[PDB]
Amino acid sequence: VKLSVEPVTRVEGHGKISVSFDDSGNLDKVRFHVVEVRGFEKFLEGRYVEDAPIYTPRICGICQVAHHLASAKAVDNVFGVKIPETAELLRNLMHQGATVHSHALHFYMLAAPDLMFPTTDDVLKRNLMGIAKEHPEIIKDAIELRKAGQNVVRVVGGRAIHPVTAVVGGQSKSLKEEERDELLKLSERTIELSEKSIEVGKKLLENIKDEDLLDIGYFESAHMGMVNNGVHDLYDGKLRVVNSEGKVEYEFDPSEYMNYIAEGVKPYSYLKFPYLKDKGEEDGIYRVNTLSRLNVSDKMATPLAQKYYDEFVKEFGKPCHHPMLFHYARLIELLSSAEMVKELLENDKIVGEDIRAEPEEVVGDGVGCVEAPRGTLIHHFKTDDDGIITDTNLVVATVQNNPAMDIGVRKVAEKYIKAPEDATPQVLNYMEMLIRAYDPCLSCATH
Amino acid sequence: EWEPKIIGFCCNWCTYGGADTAGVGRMQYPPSIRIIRVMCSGRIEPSLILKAFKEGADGVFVGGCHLGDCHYDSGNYKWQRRVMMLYELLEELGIEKERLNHEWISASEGEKFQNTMKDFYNKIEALGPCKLKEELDK
Amino acid sequence: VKIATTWLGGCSGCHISLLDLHEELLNLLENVELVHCPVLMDVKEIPDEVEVALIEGGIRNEENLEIAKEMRERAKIVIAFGTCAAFGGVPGLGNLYSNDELLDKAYKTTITTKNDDGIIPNEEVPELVSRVKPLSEVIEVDYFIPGCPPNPEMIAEVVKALLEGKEPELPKKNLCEECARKKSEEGVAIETIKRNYEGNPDPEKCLLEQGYICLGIATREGCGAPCPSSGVPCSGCSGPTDAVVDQGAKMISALCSDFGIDNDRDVDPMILPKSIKDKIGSFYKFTLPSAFVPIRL
Numbered sequence A: 001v002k003l004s005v006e007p008v009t010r011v012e013g014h015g016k017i018s019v020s021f022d023d024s025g026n027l028d029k030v031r032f033h034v035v036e037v038r039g040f041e042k043f044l045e046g047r048y049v050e051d052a053p054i055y056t057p058r059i060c061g062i063c064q065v066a067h068h069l070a071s072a073k074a075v076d077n078v079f080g081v082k083i084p085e086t087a088e089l090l091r092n093l094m095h096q097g098a099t100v101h102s103h104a105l106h107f108y109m110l111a112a113p114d115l116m117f118p119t120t121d122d123v124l125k126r127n128l129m130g131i132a133k134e135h136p137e138i139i140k141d142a143i144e145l146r147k148a149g150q151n152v153v154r155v156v157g158g159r160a161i162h163p164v165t166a167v168v169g170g171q172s173k174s175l176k177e178e179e180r181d182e183l184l185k186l187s188e189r190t191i192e193l194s195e196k197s198i199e200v201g202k203k204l205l206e207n208i209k210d211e212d213l214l215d216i217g218y219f220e221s222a223h224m225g226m227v228n229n230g231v232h233d234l235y236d237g238k239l240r241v242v243n244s245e246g247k248v249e250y251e252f253d254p255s256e257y258m259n260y261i262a263e264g265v266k267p268y269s270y271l272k273f274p275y276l277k278d279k280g281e282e283d284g285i286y287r288v289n290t291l292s293r294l295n296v297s298d299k300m301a302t303p304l305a306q307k308y309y310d311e312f313v314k315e316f317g318k319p320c321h322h323p324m325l326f327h328y329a330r331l332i333e334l335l336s337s338a339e340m341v342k343e344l345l346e347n348d349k350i351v352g353e354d355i356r357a358e359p360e361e362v363v364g365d366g367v368g369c370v371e372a373p374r375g376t377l378i379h380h381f382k383t384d385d386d387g388i389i390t391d392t393n394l395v396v397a398t399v400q401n402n403p404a405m406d407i408g409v410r411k412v413a414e415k416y417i418k419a420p421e422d423a424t425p426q427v428l429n430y431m432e433m434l435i436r437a438y439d440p441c442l443s444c445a446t447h
Numbered sequence B: 001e002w003e004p005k006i007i008g009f010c011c012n013w014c015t016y017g018g019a020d021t022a023g024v025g026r027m028q029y030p031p032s033i034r035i036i037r038v039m040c041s042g043r044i045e046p047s048l049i050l051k052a053f054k055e056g057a058d059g060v061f062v063g064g065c066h067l068g069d070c071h072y073d074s075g076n077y078k079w080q081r082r083v084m085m086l087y088e089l090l091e092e093l094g095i096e097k098e099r100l101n102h103e104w105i106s107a108s109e110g111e112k113f114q115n116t117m118k119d120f121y122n123k124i125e126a127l128g129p130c131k132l133k134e135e136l137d138k
Numbered sequence C: 001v002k003i004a005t006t007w008l009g010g011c012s013g014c015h016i017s018l019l020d021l022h023e024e025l026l027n028l029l030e031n032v033e034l035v036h037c038p039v040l041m042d043v044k045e046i047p048d049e050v051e052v053a054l055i056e057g058g059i060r061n062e063e064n065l066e067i068a069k070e071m072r073e074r075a076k077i078v079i080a081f082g083t084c085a086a087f088g089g090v091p092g093l094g095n096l097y098s099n100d101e102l103l104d105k106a107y108k109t110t111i112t113t114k115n116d117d118g119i120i121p122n123e124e125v126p127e128l129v130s131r132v133k134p135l136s137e138v139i140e141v142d143y144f145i146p147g148c149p150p151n152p153e154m155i156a157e158v159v160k161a162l163l164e165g166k167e168p169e170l171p172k173k174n175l176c177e178e179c180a181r182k183k184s185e186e187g188v189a190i191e192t193i194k195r196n197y198e199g200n201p202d203p204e205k206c207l208l209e210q211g212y213i214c215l216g217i218a219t220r221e222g223c224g225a226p227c228p229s230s231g232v233p234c235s236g237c238s239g240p241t242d243a244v245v246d247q248g249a250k251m252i253s254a255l256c257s258d259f260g261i262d263n264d265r266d267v268d269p270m271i272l273p274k275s276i277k278d279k280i281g282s283f284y285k286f287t288l289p290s291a292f293v294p295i296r297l
């Protein structure tokens, strides 16, 4: 007997789950398959390097800002140019606003339907329309958060989806004093709604705990995230890796990522299986984003988020390996990003006119790195003396959570499925809930 | 077993007359080409040549007045700038530069037109068929 | 009114622009009956009797082809949702290489890839189609919403017109209309061609007249021209107007015509081809699959 969950819904991209049974009717193989690939790494060859921040956002419509900025950083390294401080603040403001939009989008429109209705037979109710009918306030708040995030991106990036201001040497336009004032006034409401969102999460995750679903897909692994002097940072710093017990294995500059990360290939998925080179395929499994970033960080960079982080650490410890608690970690980051938008808008250097540095002589190699809302994002480009791309490598966030998703769906089936009859619509949805906990972006992951 | 499919674009004042002269003088040449009439070579743009290759052309020929002798004074200078870019674009698309041929032939140059048709035909016959349409029809 | 959506070889950006309707999304969803949308609901199969269908992305693999054909049979009206579905989009640049080259790079030669047996995923995954194709090349498309992604207002305008029973109408002019940059009354004249990083562009003058390859002249309006307003040239993400089939060919025609027009008889015709080292990437970023020559042989 062979069952297939396709397509996996309320996830970005194309994925599917296969569940097979042996001749006796016992659970045999459970796999997570990603059924798409576009080949961005190869088709970027021959393109102008300065055009990478125009092409990479098209890898994903949700986290297009992360790609635009990761590409811009790689391009800045190819030209050997250090951008002015105002440009760094504008790029970070754009990045923080995009994180607010992405985290709010996933938690409310993709994850909340299962956290609110984890044991429903009504499939037509498990979505944002179903939540809006009984709790309209929750969806209005989600929309207002997304609107605030996208507005910051639209103003600093020029476009809400696929921004264009991060150019060689800095930004193509400056933030005007009147624009900065408007965004700063609107920034306070985003922080309030983010605090409100964390409380909605506590309640919904309590409901999940009551149904014995808080430990679905549980397994222990290493965790990776960017840190700036040990502080949680989504824009600048070094990449830190902690083992399953919280011990820092290593800390490295993103330009040396090829000496620590490896990507395996399995015949049943277009999504690769990364791991820590020194440890291997099984002992070197690691996770990225939200909870993994909280696990590697000494503390948060903002005060309100730090308070929820302290309360969470005291209750679940460090490191927390629970896939479902990635939902809670996501809400803490949603607040930290909202707080950072305000913090960056309060920095007088944000409205400066020295936004660009003249491109220096070309260097045929540049690595760009940022923490995309779904994990560590690395854009690596190699070019010729004319600045034409010759080789590229993209290690895109969710790919690093592929092993965790494949293991997790197997663990969910092991817990609830013994025979084909046990695979009820609700139990099949439990497997998708584990997938959703990681906020996967499958178009992103395969690129 | 195979004959090249060549499309031609000739200006009404010079190359069209040059092709007529070749005909009046019974100047024989291969029957692969099919000529399209325009008033000036300045009417020719990348879109018409790329469209021809899409349709299955093995070779594309363009004929205009001599530089400085355009019936409309300078239409051929714009086409000359367009064709130089088009030659390199074809190479980037895997189409041999040699599959496109542009020449300056007057209304009195029947013999030159005949030899240009013979040379272009021989060039395309040697290259073999352009497999674009076959790749697109897959 | 039963409405459905699906995605093929795109990035989800068109669906995100639909969500960028914000408060208006709820007003829209109360009028229409959403019966299938992978990103928002769990209805797995496309149901029968769909009145309007929004299909995002172009055709990249065999599954996209099946879904496109299935949605066409179930929906009365099919809409090519976004530049990928209408013209092929950025993934279309993959047509400049063979599928084996795209796959060998992603699963073998990338610096971090470890593939011992040297295999390409082939189990429970669909094969790639020979080349990226716009939706209209495989199924009958009734309407299309251009843009990468289309602005949220345009998406609502098109959908609203179809709910009322009216025929949707898209803007017809090129981008210079909406662009706030000042043009020379004497006409456009290009002296030299520069790459976007060369020099410091004047914020008031037309970028094309300054020597930058701006696609605004060969691109449909509607976006509000945010790129030139932000200090960078238009990349042509909205595609061509209704009177132009091959955007790149027409952009090349215009650029070549005005290059050295003040010195027309003496300007060297080899400066322009020599100055542009990436032609396809300069003129076919978002429309290569819809071009007359949509692949590299």
Ligand code: NFU
Binding pocket: A012, A060, A061, A062, A063, A064, A066, A067, A102, A372, A373, A374, A375, A376, A377, A396, A397, A398, A399, A440, A441, A442, A444, A445
């Ligand atoms: N967040 C995010 Fe992307 Ni749609 C993923 N996965 C990128 O780096």
Ligand code: SF4
Binding pocket: A058, A061, C010, C011, C012, C013, C014, C015, C056, C057, C081, C082, C083, C084, C085, C089, C090, C147, C148, C149, C150
């Ligand atoms: S048209 Fe643009 S935004 Fe829409 S799916 Fe394609 S790349 Fe994404």
Ligand code: SF4
Binding pocket: C175, C176, C179, C180, C181, C183, C205, C206, C207, C208, C209, C214, C215, C216, C217, C225, C228, C233, C234
């Ligand atoms: S900058 Fe581009 S869109 Fe604006 S007027 Fe010049 S060519 Fe047109």
Ligand code: SF4
Binding pocket: C148, C216, C219, C220, C223, C224, C225, C226, C227, C228, C233, C234, C235, C236, C237, C238, C239
């Ligand atoms: S200016 Fe050009 S590239 Fe930018 S959004 Fe408009 S159509 Fe797209």
Ligand code: FES
Binding pocket: B011, B012, B013, B014, B015, B039, B040, B041, B042, B064, B065, B070, B071, B072, B073, B074, B075, B076
């Ligand atoms: S008329 Fe012959 S080229 Fe202008």
Ligand SMILES: [Fe+3]
Binding pocket: A041, A393, A394, A395, A396, A446, A447, C110
């Ligand atoms: Fe990759």
